[PDB]
């Protein structure tokens, strides 16, 4: 039996750093108003098979796009996302703009996700195919790290538009279209069928389904 | 064995997400001007022994504070850091003040570092000791994630002052002293003695030793 109003359960959500930054603030009001002793922990993605973390209960929900989670896994598709490019407000390419070749000759920072089997790996692969190897100056596993490096140096960064907009709304980056075609991605929450009937998991699942991920955090 | 002006070597630096965000932008000018094909990859901290990653050449340099790195390891202490608290400018306790009692009754997000054996674990331990368990609403392994969440919710975040001051520029955090006695920490670069004589490693270490970590990134 799980009662949100009195529980002190610590829920663990596996997600990229941006996924955590997107999710947790949108849980705050719900926690404050209805589950004041419930704790939520964001857990970084690891190389091991995520399905086993979900099966054992060491992760309650995975939040992201995880193409290799299937067998033994239930899902709810939360939203669809598209990629854009960002550069800092004082980037010298802004004076005359970029055609596709000038883009390829700029310096880039890449977020790598193939080691975590996160759907961003599809974009990573396309960028690695597109770009001259010497054009790639930085690599990182974390989205927020790459965004703040783009604010402080002349590197181009290709990222989900929700992440881009968060920084653009604060003044630090400007957004422009990716000059090649990239897939859109589906972001979902995932749980193991072993916990499909668990009252705590069900509660968190349903809370997440109520979240508006295109809007500011409530309250 | 190594010439920076022509090298296409990919150096891997292990660090917290803030450490990566601190380090890489401060390498950019050096790379642009003296080593245009050298790539730098920020690598997240992991639960396994970091000494083995340095030993195997899997990581070139570790950057941060790692109290369990010793046998087989050479270090250079780069700077000392102290902690502060941040809260968003629209947080209620802003006016009241942040006395210890009011601090304890606020909601907190804690950056957990003990699993990575990073020196922030010392501050983590002090907070967990003083705060009631119901005061801790969120946990994350990522400093930048926690800063985004503090910017967007009424949680209090206790962090290195260099992260706080820089992060408070955009968006709107207010910095407070922590009403707890906290140690300062030493930030160092770490390498394995096996690569003490590797010319590529030597070059990168000396570049790092010339960085002003108290100043903005060059350019
Ligand atoms: O991991 C992600 C999540 Cl959960 C959401 C978005 Cl929009 C992007 C990423 Cl990379
Ligand atoms: O990992 C860190 C580094 Cl490398 C530098 C500072 Cl100032 C703080 C942290 Cl948490």
Swiss-Prot record, chains A, B:
Keywords assigned: Activator, Aromatic hydrocarbons catabolism, DNA-binding, Transcription, Transcription regulation
GO biological process, one term: catabolic process
Coiled-coil stretches: none
KW Transcription regulation (keyword) present: yes
GO molecular function, one term: DNA binding
Function noted in UniProt: Transcriptional activator for the pcpA, pcpB and pcpE genes for pentachlorophenol (PCP) degradation. Essential for PCP degradation.
Family in the record: Belongs to the LysR transcriptional regulatory family.
Name of the protein: PCP degradation transcriptional activation protein
Native species: Sphingobium chlorophenolicum
Complete-protein stretch covered: 89 to 307 of 307
